[PDB]
Amino acid sequence: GSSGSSGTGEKPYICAECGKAFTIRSNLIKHQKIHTKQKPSGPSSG
């Protein structure tokens, strides 16, 4: 939170899939994983 409006000064890395923030370039990568669905093996339902 900053006086006025956000924008001036933000984490060095911010996801786009959802819009999260991180500090360690890696810490962010790991997250991106949760944004990579993995369809099941077989019929959708049944």
Binding residues for Zn ion, rule: CB under 5 A, are 15, 17-18, 20
Tell the smallest beta-carbon distance from residue 21 to Zn ion (Å): 10
Tell the smallest beta-carbon distance from residue 35 to Zn ion (Å): 5
Structure tokens at 7: 């924008």
Nearer to Zn ion among residue 13 and residue 20 (C-beta): 20
The CB density around residue 32, as the number of other CB atoms within 10 Å, is 13
Tell the smallest beta-carbon distance from residue 15 to Zn ion (Å): 3
Backbone angles phi, psi at 28, to 5 degrees: -75, -50
